Amino acid sequence: FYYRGGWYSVNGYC
Amino acid sequence: GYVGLKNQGATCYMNSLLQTLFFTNQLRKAVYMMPTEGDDSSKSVPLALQRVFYELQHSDKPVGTKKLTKSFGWETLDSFMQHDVQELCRVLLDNVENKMKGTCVEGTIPKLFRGKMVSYIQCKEVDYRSDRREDYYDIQLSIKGKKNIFESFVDYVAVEQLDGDNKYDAGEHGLQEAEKGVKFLTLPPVLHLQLMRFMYDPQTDQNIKINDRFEFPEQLPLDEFLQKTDPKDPANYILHAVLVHSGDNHGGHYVVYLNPKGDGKWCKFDDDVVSRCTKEEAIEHNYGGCTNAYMLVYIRESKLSEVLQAVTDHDIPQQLVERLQEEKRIE
Q: Catalytic one among B89, B192, B253, B290?
């Protein structure tokens, strides 16, 4: 998912 | 006196989530009340959650989750590893919410987990502003560059500048510079807070974990971040569960810490083994900087007794108990 100026995940997958 | 869950396949965070949902007693009682009398056990996720919760309540032996994984169709090896902990929670909670529709426990899922949020875009140049309201069942908070949960909430409600190449289209007013922001109207009695523990690179298609130190308190004051505060119900929350992932990538060791009664008596839930643990091992040892928390569960102090209400064996309907007991006999 996207937030501020980058893409993040919890548990680590995108 | 709490039983664990069998490792079985690579369920990843599922066992950690199931215990968290199980010890949300108000959810568990409503789950038992779901009318799964006519449901076929193959594709019935509401019934499978009842079976898991019932075994977590009446089994000294480790509890299995094989049927539950089949219920919502995450049978492939990568299914959990291609997904997220909040995504799994939505699948489980949406299915039970539909099941409770038209029953005495209808609206239980929105009542416990849903809050009200406002997102606004105010044009700086002209007199234009949009004020959409969106409901939320979970909050994802940024840990990169933030020291504690307070700074994450500060950055969450921080205003974003829509200038330069990313100006806001105001239609008849035209393209203009604006500020985008989010404010909290209501906070749910049960607060699911997921931490952005991983950063992803679109260019190289690589996931990098953020093992930086991120602090979460035992007691969380959130009245400040509400748009309007309410006396007689301050937004003060108590830490209930700490979901921890020790690995350095998706997949690894997923473990959850809980104090189910809200008494501060913390236990460590590592699949089959449920061992009593220290508050120190629960809160601060998972601040990070291998083991670090990726999800936190807070319960509002006013709703502490009601959410964590005592559950008896008489709460479970006899029909459901006999149906579950019959299947165990056939095995």
A: B253
**Half-sphere exposure of residue B141, counting CA atoms within 13 Å on the CB side?**
27
Is B250 catalytic? The answer is: no
Distance to chain B for A1, nearest Cα, Å: 9
Residue B201: CB atoms within 10 A of its CB come to 12
Tokens in use for B239? 């830490």
Across chain B, where does the E strand assignment appear? 115-123, 129-136, 139-142, 160-162, 168-169, 175-176, 178-184, 190-196, 198-201, 206-209, 219-221, 236-245, 254-258, 267-270, 273-276, 292-300
Residue B12 catalytic?
A: yes
CATH class of the B115-136+157-187 domain in this structure: mainly beta
Partner residues linked to B135 by β-bridges: B116
Domain boundaries, chain B: 4-114+302-331, 115-136+157-187, 137-156+188-301
Resolution of this structure in Å: 2.5
Distance from CA of residue B148 to its chain's centroid? 19
